[PDB]
Assembly symmetry: D2
């Protein structure tokens, strides 16, 4: 199959590229891959473990191997012998110039970038480069996945976002003020009839205009925002307190990381998309809102080794309060990269099975799942198991 990756040279994207190839050459286990659990046997009939990559980037380096080695140099999150083995394959992967349109102040923190909007292109001219890049790569087994730096909350507009006819009116009128890059790549992929997922809290295809386009074109799509570590624990453990009829009176979630993700998120406008996504799950699960605080801070020594400190204060019998603390220490790229490969395969499955529009049953992968109030990790895992069985 083919995966077009937005933000192709990022750490999640390149680790997924590295892992795909290492697994295919026989030199790495299949750990981490949900699509490889026993419940999903038979998936290889529809979406075999077999990948070619392309993508869009704004940080142009020469190819995906150079990009993979840069992140590896700082992180050493897989073995040198893997990097060497997949070098040749990755050196053949060369990203194309994307758009950082309205992606917030945090993009400054990436250093040397080049973008389509920086060439003076109108929105319509931009959309055409993007589509030309994707379609020249795409086949009948291609999916597009956004792994780009998180954008800030967009300037929402009813006219331009609330219908597909209004969204295309935006493009025709070149009204950039209301377009963000994640929407343009989503639009390009759905217009081309490719399945799409959004791994980030950017809006992507999560506006009605693009949901309406997905249904009309008969294309499945999924999102938003990879739920990979601290928020995974949150949607696993919060349920325990409800099962036992306990009130959660406060939940603190404090995250510190470095590398390119922590750097963009060091900016206040970019940080807000991610924080809101992480914060808001509590109410949806419990029915009420405990005093929550969720923060992300840059901490460069940690590089991609994001660490999360959480504290949960909660009331039990007779009203007495009590305390639970947890600390999560993981490489972000390691818990996210297999999910990119899972999402790609499940999208292809859903595509081959006639599924259109939001695949709400992929909520399990995401912090902010489209079209569903199923947040609980256990329930999400049941829904995804059952969804697959119903279509298999």
């Amino acid at each position: 199959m083919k995966v077009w990756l937005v933000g192709a040279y990022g750490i999640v994207s390149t680790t997924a590229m590295v892992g795909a190839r290492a697994i295919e050459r026989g030199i790495a286990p299949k750990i981490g891959l949900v699509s490889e659990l026993p419940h999903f046997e038979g998936i290889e009939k529809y979406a075999p473990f077999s990948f070619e990559f392309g993508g869009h980037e704004i940080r142009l380096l020469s190819n995906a191997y150079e990009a993979a080695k840069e992140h590896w140099e700082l992180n050493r999150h897989f073995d040198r012998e893997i990097l060497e083995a997949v070098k040749s394959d990755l050196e053949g992967i060369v990203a194309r110039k994307g758009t950082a349109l309205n992606c917030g102040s945090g993009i400054k923190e990436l250093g040397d970038i080049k973008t389509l909007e920086g060439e003076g292109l109108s929105l319509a001219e931009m959309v055409s480069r993007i589509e030309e890049d994707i379609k020249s790569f795409a086949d009948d087994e291609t999916v597009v996945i956004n792994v780009a730096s998180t954008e800030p909350l967009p300037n929402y507009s009813e006219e331009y976002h609330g219908s597909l006819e209004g969204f295309e009116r935006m493009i025709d009128e070149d009204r950039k003020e209301y377009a963000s890059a994640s929407m343009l790549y989503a639009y390009a992929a759905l217009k081309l009839g490719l399945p799409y997922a959004n791994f980030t809290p950017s809006p992507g295809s999560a506006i009605p205009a693009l949901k309406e386009l997905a249904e009309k074109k008969g294309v499945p799509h999924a999102g938003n925002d990879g739920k990979t570590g601290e928020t995974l624990v949150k949607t696993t453990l919060a349920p325990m307190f409800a099962y036992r009829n306990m009130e959660v009176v406060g939940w603190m979630s404090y995250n510190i990381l470095g590398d390119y993700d922590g750097k963009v998120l060091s900016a206040r406008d970019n940080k807000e998309s991610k924080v809101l996504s992480k914060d808001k799950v509590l109410e949806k699960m419990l029915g009420y809102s405990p005093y929550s605080i969720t923060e992300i801070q840059y901490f460069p020594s940690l590089v991609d080794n994001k660490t999360a400190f959480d504290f949960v204060h909660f009331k039990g019998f007779l009203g007495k309060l009590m305390k639970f603390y947890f600390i999560w220490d993981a490489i972000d790229a390691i818990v996210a990269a297999p999910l990119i490969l899972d999402i790609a395969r499940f999208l292809l499955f859903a595509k081959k099975k006639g599924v259109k529009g939001v695949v709400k049953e992929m909520a399990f992968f995401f912090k902010s799942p489209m079209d569903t109030n199923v947040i609980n990790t256990h329930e999400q895992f049941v829904v995804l198991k059952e969804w697959y069985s119903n279509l298999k």
Copy 2:
């Protein structure tokens, strides 16, 4: 309804007594009570929030109020104004002299005790005092719940434990070597046709002899071992790692507490029942055994404020290892006492609905659930919800 409590003067038992009454007088919330969740509406038709207490003890103090105040003095785990309000009610609760038969070396740590076996009674003569105590209290809405100090692993015997006819042959032959107190109280309650639950890792009714008696007499029973804090988190979080296709390579669980429970468990023979119960859940959920360590140590300054430190080392994509840590800080009596009241009400429900034998669907309350391989907290909560709906 009536609850006969084995270990009536313990902290869990007295906190439950205090809480029952405080709730009934209107001065405490219903937090902590599973049986008060919205899914279980209508339960009050079969098991209203309404309790009278009695029980067996070996530490004879004058009454349940003196016993409640002693634990309160050290713990202050509810307000003085609650203690004052429920004083009169508790002063009417007076335990009867039980048996500490073969309850292990740790019983020395309780100080001044008096027991039936210490009076020279045969097993048959013991069983008769126990039954006479219980039946003089019991009505058609009575349940017996074991909350006594944890016993060591028993000397298991096929003849004497593997059939009801062999168990009664033990009693007739006065073969004490093979009887433990928890089995004698279980036997007494089931012989009398009362529902029984075991809140501790002692054997209780979890031997075939007594399971066979429960079916024959048509009595429901449940157990074993309240799953209340660290093991609750364990059966909630371990699933997350399986959902994501991660290998758990080691799990450490280190617990330190004081008061009467930590004191009995300071003994190596008594400690083993509890440790095995806490340890063994991992395999049952995951399919394989990570390197696990589970310890309990006395730490007197903590009194009933058991604190648990856990560390989970686990492999993800590409085999890279990663770390999760958690610390649990709660009053044991506070997370256990509402469950005693829940178990009592659910037993009465099950009784009134024609249920006999092990109520496997009460696994949610227990670390070592009888007759079931459902360990996962989420699944256990679904089974209990569904069980109730099917009988309501």
Copy 3:
């Protein structure tokens, strides 16, 4: 002796009042009191354990007992029987109306307040009420200690703060823009010849104008900012890494609390004084600056039970990095209140021994010690021991 307390109805101030009296009535141990360590035997010759209180407040409640009970109701940080025992004594303590001049936006969070500036008084008229209040209370064994809500960083001015003649020119010209309440109370106390300490990161007497006045008047003074929990651990543990020739590459300090202190500090202008004070100690001890982050967030369920999460990332032999984590769980009022009593006694000692100006050797009590680069807790404790011996 007498202690005039600025912020008399706060939690630290009232807990110190409660504790003083409980100790004097014989019903509480002397734990927590540095001045009661064996090295300081003989101090009772100069500063016996014997206290009368008065003070300034802007939250006017009826008396110090009402104020003590309000904090106790939420915190229960000492026993009911103590509160009852010291009730009569505290009911005789009635604060006088102070000034919240330029104390930042966070003062809104205290609710109902009344202030001298709110009466239209000029600076000179304000200074006169303050001095009249203090002098009508003061004797030859009186000290004034600021325990008021933390102010923001002041508008610093060379003319008005850099000399005593320029500071009094400010008062004569009624130039409020450049005066903050903490400076006015410091000025009032030093003008009256009373020793002064500042327990907060407000400026207080830490401007040259007031240091010059302290020397001229021959009055000892100390500050700034009680070092009581997380920053105490910081100045104790950071040294370990230097002793062992390790580079600290990052130190995160994340604090969450509620009650009146967390509420005022929830405001960004007020928060900054405290954060800078907590943050800046690292460089002073180590010689260089690790990447540090220090945050304070409101978390109301915790009330005065401030909890601190810290993480220290550090390099060792061969450059390999490594991790230390700590979590501090304490009642702020409990670790601060005995130090108020210690500071008062040590000030009186220093006064009776002819000491004038900044008592730099009291650095041990403070996060931002005036006139000293001795930050290390061990060194600070040696300096204070030696200082006392040299004057005893």
Copy 4:
């Protein structure tokens, strides 16, 4: 200089070998080396950074490079490029066959071993091989350092250990029952006039017989037991509580590690030396004994990445209790290896400066310092600074 290392192929020993050479070839920083702090400038006049190695082992592998690579393969605690750079140097280091005489049951856990006692040699014949090995290597700038697996507590004997004349009577009588390997290597080194340090809690030279021999021969010696991580924090932080007049009511120290050290310590007899050494520091610093628990457990996934969980429960003002928690995550070999090089250089310094007998002023390096009640890390660091200045 030369360092003879007992347990030459262990992880601490080989990491120190690797580091020495990497530093000398210019490719690693001097971080971790106390002897490289600015206070110790001029030490290179007496003990330059310049090392040749030899040693005794019972696990015979071909040479020190093979041994270094085995630990590296599991731990990756320095870079591959370092291992490659120092390969040739280490391949020239070949250990000689030592003695595991009375080293406890845990030695079984090392797998394939060969020993002098296994050849049938008497004690006197053993002592002669050891001395012949050491003296054929030794020069006027040689030191012997024990880094061997921890032994159990020895069978102490007044006759055979309480005097040098009684110790040699043991050797003459071939009374093995009373000799342990660590004493034999200590004896061999001091008889040969070499300085000796003991990095482990084995007895080594810490018996009067050998202390008396050190004085008589005029040889300096130091020990016992590298204080490197959790116990370093303990002797740094415990003082804070005394400085502030707080009672420590309980301290739990729970350690889990794997590799060869955790494996030997998995045995109950070997574990006890280390646990007692770690536990007993509290009383010596504070004056009294808090309820302490100190445990070490094998946890193989962690290899040499020992992790320590500690909890400190302590009383403050008014008697209110409060909690501090810490977690230490470090590679044991990384915090210990530079200290071997420091100890060697400081021993040579002390030797060249006429120092004889126990160098009590090296207590800073050790958990159980000989001939001193100075336990506090700060005081220990002052003593070592001052000692060096006095002799420089």
